[PDB]
C-alpha cells in the first residue's frame, strides 16, 4: 500500500515482466513501454551469455532455492552494479524457462525466489543509485 507498493512496482517492471516474456506466459506487447526498452539490454545480455556457456540443470522447490541463492549471492558478494542486475534478471529467466519447459510447475518458485532476493538484497542499492530511471538510462548504452 505504501513503500511496499513502490518496491512491488519496481521489481514487477524490472524483473518479473522480462521473465514472463522469456517464458511464453506473456506476449511481447503485454509489456509496459519501460519493459521492451530494457528488454533490449536483457536480451543482449542473454545472447552475450549464450556465447560464453550453456546452462543445464532441478527437481524440487528446495533445489531451486539453494541453487539459485548460491549463484546470485556469489554474484553480489563482491559488489553490486546494474550490469550484474541484468545477469540476475537473465539468470532468473533461464531457470524459469527450464521449469516451464519441464512442465514441473516450479517456475512460480523461481519468480518468487528472485523477487524475494531482489527485494532484500538489491533494492536498497538500486533505489540509492537511480532505481527504475537509471536502469532505463542503463538500457540505452551503445546501439552498435
Amino acid at each position: 500500500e505504501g513503500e511496499e507498493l513502490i518496491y512491488h512496482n519496481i521489481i514487477n517492471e524490472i524483473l518479473v515482466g522480462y521473465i514472463k516474456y522469456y517464458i511464453n506466459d506473456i506476449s511481447e506487447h503485454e509489456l509496459s513501454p519501460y519493459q521492451q526498452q530494457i528488454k533490449k539490454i536483457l536480451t543482449y545480455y542473454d545472447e552475450c551469455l549464450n556465447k560464453q556457456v550453456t546452462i543445464t540443470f532441478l527437481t524440487s522447490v528446495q533445489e531451486i532455492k539453494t541453487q539459485f541463492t548460491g549463484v546470485v549471492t556469489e554474484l553480489f558478494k563482491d559488489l553490486i552494479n546494474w550490469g550484474r542486475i541484468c545477469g540476475f534478471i537473465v539468470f532468473s529467466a533461464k531457470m524459469a524457462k527450464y521449469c516451464k519447459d519441464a512442465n514441473n510447475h516450479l517456475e512460480s518458485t523461481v519468480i518468487t525466489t528472485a523477487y524475494n532476493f531482489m527485494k532484500h538484497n538489491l533494492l536498497p542499492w538500486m533505489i540509492s543509485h537511480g532505481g527504475q530511471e537509471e536502469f532505463l538510462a542503463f538500457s540505452l548504452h551503445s546501439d552498435m
Binding site: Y45, C48, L49, V72, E74, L75, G83, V90
Partner: peptide, 19 residues
C-alpha cells in the same frame, strides 16, 4: 559448477557497466 557461472555473470555485467 556454480562459482564459475557467477564470475561469468559478473564479468559480463562488468563489461556492460562500462562507460
Amino acid at each position: 559448477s556454480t562459482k564459475k557461472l557467477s564470475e561469468c555473470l559478473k564479468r559480463i555485467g562488468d563489461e556492460l557497466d562500462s562507460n
